[PDB]
UniProtKB/Swiss-Prot annotation, chain A:
Pfam families: DNA_pol3_delt_C (PF14840), DNA_pol3_delta (PF06144). It comes from Escherichia coli (strain K12). The gene is holA. GO terms for cellular component: DNA polymerase III complex; DNA polymerase III, clamp loader complex; replisome. The DNA polymerase III holoenzyme complex contains at least 10 different subunits organized into 3 functionally essential subassemblies: the Pol III core, the beta sliding clamp processivity factor and the clamp-loading complex. The Pol III core (subunits alpha, epsilon and theta) contains the polymerase and the 3'-5' exonuclease proofreading activities. The polymerase is tethered to the template via the dimeric beta sliding clamp processivity factor. It comes from the Bacteria. GO terms for biological process: DNA replication; DNA-templated DNA replication. The keyword Zinc does not apply. This is DNA polymerase III subunit delta.
UniProtKB/Swiss-Prot annotation, chain B:
Changing residue 146 to L: No effect on synthesis of beta*. The lineage of its organism: Bacteria, Pseudomonadati, Pseudomonadota, Gammaproteobacteria, Enterobacterales. Residues 129-243 are annotated as: 2. Forms a ring-shaped head-to-tail homodimer around DNA, which can be opened by the delta subunit. Binds interacting factors in a hydrophobic surface cleft between domains 2 and 3, each monomer is able to bind different proteins simultaneously. The beta* isoform probably forms homotrimers which probably load onto DNA. The DNA polymerase III holoenzyme complex contains at least 10 different subunits organized into 3 functionally essential subassemblies: the Pol III core, the beta sliding clamp processivity factor and the clamp-loading complex. Changing residue 24 to A: Mild defect in DNA replication, impaired loading of clamp on DNA, polymerase speed is wild-type. More severe replication defect and very poor clamp loading. The gene is dnaN. Pfam families: DNA_pol3_beta, DNA_pol3_beta_2, DNA_pol3_beta_3. SUPFAM superfamilies: DNA clamp. This is Beta sliding clamp. Small molecules can bind to the hydrophobic cleft and inhibit binding of various protein factors, suggesting this may make and attractive antibiotic target.
């Protein structure tokens, strides 16, 4: 088997398509990019048919199999992408996979997407069946130290002149979410054909621009928008965004609502509102309004702690708490 | 605005205009209807920004100008959930839709009709008529063969084309293909458009054997169907749709003619006889004999024979049970003719009696 890194795929993919590709990792952008590099290069070699299946306890394996045994009316080859369950290849799944690793003919490339194969699961039948007749791409989310260069790089391969400082900034606010950092850059890119992403512009890109997603969530909180709020909370992690960020922002908005609350009649709605550079009216106005201070402190107590656990309880829901908390 | 009319001249129209739509629309405007009154006619309009139905109803009883956008789901259940024969009086009250069925009066929240996204009109480029039933069969005969969610988006819809005085549709998921041609009655130019899933579905819907021989207008990037009072309109899919002629088997040696229902059996039987359904059927044609056995790669079980009219060498070809069955069903005939070549190249099933339609199915890996 060939073990590769996203920035090596396109190469050992140009030399010649293998028979199967295993995109293993926790990062969602990298997985999506690699499966695209593949189906792209592929699609430019007759592979015009594609199909994706989710491997769970409902996978109509027949269809998948029947699919392999199929012949194109326009002689076009085909791709088959398989989405493994969260945990990994199940015990029954190891069976079906095995069957299929045998139906793998030629006008049929195969991709398997998932997390690092459960430590001894690379012993499974199907795996070893492909092991030397395939390629493995490791799509892991880089992190803290390694995140900067991943951005520094990404920028460069986009022919951008990102500043040392501004790189760090972008890293601080999107930290952990590759898709955000990517699309961020894509965006500043168009806002300045100039090509120079200086600190001020990054800041202006994160600040001025309200495309700092958590703000959308922190928004739902004020507006007591639980349902649609949770949705945002969900997506917020189907992008790979790290929670250590959602808190810090809200942990401010919220702190303000405390400063604001402690002055309902100390100085009132447009009086003190025309003071702290928030004037949202309906929002902060809905919050302090519909929401009390007995509730407010609990929320601050909670969040405060949730962001003390992952630092002093490291290793291993406490956000839907806050969500539902700020409401009901 | 204000108008009043029975619960009959309304439910039917109100059912066809919102028929295709109905769910959890995006913006509230997409799940709303467009009510208008002018020249003594109330016009309902529904749309999902892909296609849009528009009913025309001449207001017999008292009417009055105005344009409003009331919800669809709601506005329909109400009138549909009232005493059959009761009249309905609707009037635009500043920002609400006041209704009145006797004294069973409601009030609907409404968005401006100045915000409705009606397929801002475009330019017609062909037009013609033809009995519904004909325009119907053309669909029925090919509809099952259109891809479903293929990345090659043009396949996710049926193609329509006119050349000569023949209208012919063709659908295809790139494994099997379907084609049907019919005589319209008018010599038309030659144009070919791709009507989408939903659009074909809708078009299929309105059709129902009515004394209003469907009028059709193909065009730029739109196509509409005025069937009496209803006027369905759909946008078109754009891309190069495969040439049905480049797939028809080219000079096939092997030919066979069997029984439509006798083969259904054969295949259906072997289908069930196949406990491992992903292996498909296995046909073995030999000089006037058809041994159709459920392909069980690692096994030899029970099969069935048929006394057919064959020609050419003997060959065993694999077949996806379904693909073959849909064809036999579409072919509501008695005797089915077939043209083979190769155990790894397209086959052409088709009725013997006629040639209006023709199908082509790629065999499967044995």
């Amino acid at each position: 088997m060939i073990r590769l890194y996203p920035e090596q795929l396109r190469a050992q993919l140009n030399e010649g398509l293998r028979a199967a590709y295993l995109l293993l990792g926790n990062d969602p952008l990298l997985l999506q990019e690699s499966q695209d590099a593949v189906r792209q290069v592929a699609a430019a070699q007759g592979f015009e048919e594609h199909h994706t299946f989710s491997i769970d306890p409902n996978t109509d394996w027949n269809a998948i199999f029947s699919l392999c045994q199929a012949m194109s009316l326009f002689a076009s080859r085909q791709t088959l992408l398989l989405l493994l369950p969260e945990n990994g290849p199940n015990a029954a799944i190891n069976e079906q996979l095995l069957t299929l690793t045998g139906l793998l003919h030629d006008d049929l490339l195969l991709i398997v997407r998932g997390n690092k194969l459960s430590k001894a699961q690379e012993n499974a039948a199907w795996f070893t069946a492909l092991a030397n007749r395939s390629v493995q791409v490791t799509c892991q989310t880089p992190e803290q130290a390694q995140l900067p260069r991943w951005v520094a790089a990404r920028a460069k391969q986009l022919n951008l002149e990102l500043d040392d400082a501004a790189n760090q900034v972008l890293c601080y606010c999107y930290e952990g979410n590759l898709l955000a950092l990517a699309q961020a850059l894509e965006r500043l890119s168009l806002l300045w054909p100039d090509g120079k992403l200086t600190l001020p512009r990054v800041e202006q890109a994160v600040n001025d621009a309200a495309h700092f997603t958590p703000f959308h969530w922190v928004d739902a909180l004020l507006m007591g928008k639980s349902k649609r709020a949770l949705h945002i909370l969900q997506q917020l992690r189907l992008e790979g965004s790290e929670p250590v960020i959602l808190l810090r922002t809200l942990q401010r908005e919220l702190l303000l609502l405390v400063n604001l609350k402690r002055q309902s009649a100390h100085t009132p709605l447009r009086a003190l509102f025309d003071k702290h550079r928030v004037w949202r009216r309906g929002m902060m106005g809905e919050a302090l309004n519909r929401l009390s201070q007995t509730q407010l402190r609990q929320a601050v107590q909670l969040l405060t702690r949730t962001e003390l656990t992952l630092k002093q309880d490291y290793g291993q829901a406490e956000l839907e708490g806050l969500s539902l908390l700020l409401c009901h | 605005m204000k108008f009043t009319v029975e619960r009959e001249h309304l439910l039917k129209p109100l059912q066809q205009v919102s028929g295709p739509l109905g769910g959890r629309p995006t913006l509230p405007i997409l799940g709303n209807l467009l009510l208008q009154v002018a020249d003594g006619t109330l016009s309902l309009t529904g749309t999902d920004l892909e296609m849009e139905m528009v009913a025309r109803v001449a207001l017999v009883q008292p009417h009055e100008p105005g344009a409003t956008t009331v919800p669809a789901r709601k506005f329909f259940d109400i009138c549909r959930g009232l005493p059959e024969g009761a009249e309905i009086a609707v009037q635009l009250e500043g920002e609400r839709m006041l209704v009145r069925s006797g004294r069973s009066r409601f009030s609907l929240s409404t968005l401006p009709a100045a915000d409705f996204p009606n397929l801002d009109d475009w330019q017609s480029e062909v037009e013609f008529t033809l009995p519904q039933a004909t325009m119907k069969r053309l669909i029925e005969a090919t509809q099952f063969s259109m891809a479903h969610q293929d990345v090659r988006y043009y396949l996710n819809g049926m193609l329509f084309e006119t050349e000569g005085e023949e209208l012919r549709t063709v659908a295809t998921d790139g494994h099997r293909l379907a084609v049907c041609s019919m005589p319209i009655g008018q010599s038309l130019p030659s144009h070919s458009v791709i009507v989408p899933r939903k659009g074909v579905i809708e078009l299929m819907r309105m059709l129902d054997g009515g004394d209003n021989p469907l009028r059709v207008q193909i065009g730029s990037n739109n196509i509409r169907a005025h069937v009496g009072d209803f006027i369905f309109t759909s946008k078109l899919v754009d891309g190069r749709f495969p040439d049905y002629r480049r797939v028809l088997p080219k000079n096939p040696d092997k030919h066979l003619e069997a029984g439509c229902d006798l083969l259904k059996q054969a295949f259906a039987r072997a289908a069930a006889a196949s406990n491992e359904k992903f292996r498909g059927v296995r046909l073995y044609v030999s000089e006037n004999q058809l041994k159709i056995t459920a392909n069980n790669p690692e096994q030899e079980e029970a099969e069935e024979i048929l006394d057919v009219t064959y020609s050419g060498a003997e060959m065993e070809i694999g077949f996806n049970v379904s693909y073959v069955l849909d064809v036999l069903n579409a072919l509501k005939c008695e005797n089915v003719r077939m043209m083979l070549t190769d155990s790894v190249s397209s086959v052409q099933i088709e009725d013997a009696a006629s040639q209006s339609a023709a199908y082509v199915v790629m065999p499967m890996r044995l």
